[PDB]
Enzyme design. Structure first.
Site, short mmCIF file in Angstrom:
data_model
loop_
_atom_site.label_atom_id
_atom_site.label_comp_id
_atom_site.label_asym_id
_atom_site.label_seq_id
_atom_site.Cartn_x
_atom_site.Cartn_y
_atom_site.Cartn_z
N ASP A 89 0.82 -1.21 0.00
CA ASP A 89 0.00 0.00 0.00
C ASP A 89 0.86 1.26 0.00
O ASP A 89 0.52 2.26 -0.67
CB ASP A 89 -0.96 0.01 1.20
N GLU A 146 -2.48 -4.66 -7.17
CA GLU A 146 -3.76 -4.50 -6.48
C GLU A 146 -4.63 -5.74 -6.54
O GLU A 146 -5.39 -5.98 -5.58
CB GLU A 146 -4.51 -3.31 -7.05
N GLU A 201 -9.62 -2.50 -3.15
CA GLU A 201 -8.61 -2.96 -4.10
C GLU A 201 -9.25 -3.62 -5.30
O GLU A 201 -8.76 -3.48 -6.42
CB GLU A 201 -7.65 -3.93 -3.44
N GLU A 229 -5.35 4.11 -0.62
CA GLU A 229 -4.25 3.22 -0.30
C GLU A 229 -3.59 3.65 0.99
O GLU A 229 -3.15 2.81 1.78
CB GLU A 229 -3.19 3.20 -1.40
N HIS A 278 -5.71 2.58 3.84
CA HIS A 278 -5.47 1.16 4.09
C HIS A 278 -4.22 0.96 4.92
O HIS A 278 -4.24 0.23 5.92
CB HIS A 278 -5.33 0.40 2.79
N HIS A 315 -10.30 -0.91 -7.57
CA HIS A 315 -9.10 -0.27 -8.09
C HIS A 315 -8.54 -1.06 -9.27
O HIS A 315 -8.17 -0.51 -10.31
CB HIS A 315 -8.01 -0.19 -7.04
N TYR A 361 -3.75 -0.80 8.91
CA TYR A 361 -2.90 -1.87 9.41
C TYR A 361 -2.18 -1.43 10.69
O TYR A 361 -1.97 -2.24 11.59
CB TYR A 361 -1.85 -2.30 8.38
#
Ligand SMILES: [Cl-]
Lengths: 294, 288
Positions: free
Chosen positions: A62, A161, A195, A93, A96, A198, A100
Site C-alpha cells: 500500500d 492490487e 482494491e 491506499e 489502508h 481499483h 494496518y
C-alpha cells in the site's frame, strides 16, 4: 490549459467509479479491533508471527501504491476525470496502510511493531517484489512517456492490487473464516472491496491504452506482461514458503495466489494462465460483494 | 524498502494533519445547491458571467494541484507519513473540482457550462498563471530531484493554495455575505477550510526542506520565492481587472489578494510583503 469538466464525459466509466469509490469511503476509526484480543491470545507463537509479517508486507505494498504508483500513473493520464478517480484511489491506499497500523497497535507492543517494520525493510523477497513493481512506476519520472511505458505501469498496478496483495490477505481471511480476529477481518474485507474496484478500473484504462498501441508495441507489452506475471509468481512462491511453512498452509496460499493472478489477468482483458480455500471463502462471506466476487 | 509505520512518528505534525484532513472529509453530494436558484436569477448577466468565470478558474487550479502538484511533490518526499497526508490532500482537490461541477449543473445549461470550460482552456492569463506554477512541478519529472527543486515546488504549492485561489474565492464569499448564493457559499467555505490547512501543512514541509539547504541554495530560493510572489501578483492584477471591471469590484478583490498573499508568505515562515489591512467586511460575513 484544460480544467476537469464533469458536464462533458471523457469516457463511459470514470463517473461510475468516482461515485463508487466515494460511496465506499471509510477510515481507520470505524472498526474497533480490541475485541480481537480474545482470539489473538489463543493463536500459537508461529501463527502470530505469520499474521504480523503478512500485515507488514501488505503495508509495504500500500505504501508504494499510494506514494508512487497512483501518483505517477495519474500524472501522465490525459483524461482528467480518470485522473480524479486515481487520485482518490491513491489516498485510499494510504487509509489502508494506516488501518494496518491500527490493527498492530491493538495486537502488539510498541517494540514488537517496530521489529516487524525493521523486518519488512530488510526482507529480501519483499524488497525484490516491491522493486519489480516500482521499476515500472519510476520509468515514468520523465516529462514525456510513451503509451507502452504507461501501459506497463498500469499492468504493474493491476498486478499489485489484484494479485500481489493476496498471499498476505489469505491469512486474515483464513482466521476470520474460523471466527478468529474477525474485526481485523472486517477491515481486510473493506480493503479488499476497495482494491477490487481499483484493479478493475486501472485494468479498463490499460485496455484503452493497449488498443492505441501499434501492433509491434502490442506484441511487446503482451510479452512483458506475461514475463512480469511469472516473475512475480516465482517470488510469491518463495514468499509463501517462507511465511506459511511453519503453519502448514503453503499449498493453500499458492492456490489463492493463482486464483488472484488469473483475476488480475482478466482485469487486463487477458486469459487466465493458471489452472479458493473454503475457510477463506467464509472469511469473505461477511461482505456480500466480496463473497460474490470470489 | 520501507513501509509507513505510524507507531513511530517521522515528524511532530503529520499525524495531527492526517486526522484533521480526515475529520474534514466531505463530498459534492452533501450540500444541495438548488435553493440558490432563487437568488441566482436576481443577478445581472454581468454578475452571473463573473461568477461562472471565477469558478472555472478555481476548477483549473484544483485540477492542476490534485493532478500534478500533490503527486509530484509527494513522490519525492522521504517522510512516508507526510506523503500520506499529501495524497489525501490531493484527492480532496479533486473533490473540490467535482463540487464546482455540481454548482455549474444547478446554475447553468449544458451548453453554458461547456462554454465556460472552453473559455478557461483558451484564456491567456489562466494559462500563464497555471503554467508558472506547474513549471515547478514538472521540474520534478526526473528520478532524483534536489532539495532546491523540491522546496520551490512546495513554495509554488503554498502560493496556489493560500494565494492564487483567492481572486476567485472573493466573489462567492462576497455574494454569500449579502445573502446571495449561500448554498454555493457553504461549499466554497468547506473548500477554503481544506485549502487553509493544506497551505499550512505544505508550508511546514517547505520550512523543513529550507533548513536543509546550504546557505548558497537558501539565498537562491529566497530570491526566487520573492520574485515568484510578485510575478504572480502582476498576473493576478491583470486577472482581477478582466473579471471584475464589469461589476465594479476590482480594487476590492485586489485588497483580498494581497491579504492572502501575506498569509501564504506566513505559511512559509516568511514576513508579509503587502500592506496589512482588514479583510473586506462583506467577505468576512460570507466566511461567517
Ligand atoms: Cl506513444
Amino acid at each position: 490549459m484544460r480544467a476537469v469538466n464533469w458536464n462533458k464525459k471523457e469516457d463511459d466509466f470514470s463517473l461510475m467509479f468516482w461515485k463508487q469509490n466515494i460511496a465506499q469511503f471509510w477510515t481507520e476509526e470505524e472498526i474497533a479491533v480490541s475485541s480481537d484480543k480474545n482470539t489473538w491470545v489463543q493463536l500459537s507463537k508461529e501463527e502470530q508471527i505469520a499474521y504480523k509479517r503478512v500485515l507488514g508486507g501488505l503495508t509495504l505494498l500500500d505504501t508504494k501504491q499510494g506514494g508512487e504508483g497512483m501518483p505517477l500513473v495519474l500524472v501522465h493520464l490525459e483524461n482528467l476525470q480518470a485522473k480524479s478517480v486515481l487520485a482518490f484511489m491513491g489516498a485510499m491506499e494510504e487509509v489502508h496502510a494506516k488501518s494496518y497500523s491500527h490493527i498492530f497497535t491493538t495486537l502488539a507492543t510498541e517494540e514488537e511493531i517496530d521489529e516487524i517494520f525493521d523486518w519488512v525493510d530488510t526482507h529480501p523477497l519483499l524488497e525484490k517484489k516491491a522493486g519489480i513493481i516500482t521499476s515500472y512506476y519510476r520509468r515514468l519520472l520523465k516529462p514525456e512517456v510513451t503509451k507502452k511505458e504507461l501501459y506497463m505501469a498500469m499492468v504493474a498496478s493491476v498486478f499489485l492490487e489484484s494479485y500481489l496483495f493476496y498471499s498476505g490477505f489469505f491469512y486474515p481471511l483464513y482466521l476470520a473464516g474460523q471466527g478468529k480476529l474477525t474485526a481485523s477481518g472486517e477491515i481486510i474485507n473493506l480493503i479488499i472491496r476497495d482494491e477490487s474496484i481499483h484493479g478493475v478500473f486501472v485494468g479498463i484504462l490499460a485496455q484503452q491504452i493497449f488498443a492505441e498501441l501499434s501492433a509491434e508495441d502490442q506484441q511487446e507489452v503482451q510479452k512483458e506482461t506475461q514475463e512480469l506475471l511469472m516473475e512475480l509468481y516465482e517470488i510469491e512462491m518463495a514468499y509463501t514458503e517462507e511465511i506459511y511453512t511453519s503453519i502448514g498452509l503453503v499449498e493453500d496460499v499458492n492456490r489463492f495466489v493463482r486464483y488472484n493472478a488469473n483475476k488480475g489477468l482478466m482485469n487486463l482483458g487477458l486469459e487466465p494462465k493458471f489452472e479458493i480455500n473454503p475457510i477463506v471463502l467464509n472469511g469473505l462471506r461477511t461482505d456480500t460483494k466480496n463473497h460474490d466476487f470470489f
